[PDB]
Amino acid sequence: VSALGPGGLTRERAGFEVRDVHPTHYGRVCPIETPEGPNIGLINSLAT
DNA sequence: CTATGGGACGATAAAGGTATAAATTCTCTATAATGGGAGCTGCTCTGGCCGAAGCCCG
């Protein structure tokens, strides 16, 4: 599950709100599986 | 008796003619047609720039 693409946040609009995990991510989006680098937290993976 | 300038020579390349096919641009067609559309929206700050609105003020 990515956040980039059409109608999505660009890496220059990162900030912190999208790139942080929230209690609402529990069991929906994996908290620890994200690519390290320019796009961190923007690209995540669904939970099991 | 010999080397060198002088002049004769001539085979051909350029110059002009001179048409000639290619080729490459130019001009037309007449029912009616009479304001476009993708444009992002989730930076962040700093910095400068005009322009308006209070703020002294004599």
Side-chain angles (χ1 to χ4, degrees), chain A residues 16-32 34-35 37-43 45:
Chain A
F16 271 69
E17 210 269 0
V18 288
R19 295 189 165 182
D20 290 357
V21 317
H22 332 85
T24 181
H25 274 141
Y26 186 99
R28 261 159 292 267
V29 155
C30 180
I32 86 179
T34 195
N39 43 337
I40 172 170
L42 301 188
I43 320 191
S45 292

